[PDB]
Amino acid sequence: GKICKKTPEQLHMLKSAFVRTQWPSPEEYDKLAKESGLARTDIVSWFGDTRYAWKNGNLKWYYYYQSANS
Structure with missing residues (x-):
């Protein structure tokens, strides 16, 4: 019974995946599902939302990451 459907660890994985590629390949979505435990259709939807x-x-979390990284 939580508002944030995805767990902090799950979310933290998607953000780390997002920063490497914002348009993951068909196979990369499968891997993210496998390692996160989330359903693929939610990973695909989350990348669209993001x-x-x-x-x-x-x-903001991404822009700020770029203004510290590169």
């Missing part, structure tokens, strides 16, 4: 926020200035 990319949508990303192009509209609502993905």
Whole structure:
């Protein structure tokens, strides 16, 4: 009984996956499902949601990661 459907560890994995590639290959989605325990259709949807926020200035955690990384 939680609001955040995905666990912190699951979420932290998706964010780390997002930073390497924002358009994962068909096989990379399978792997992320396998290692996260999440259903593939949710991983695919989450990348869509994330990319949508990303192009509209609502993905601060990524921008801030880039302004410290590169």
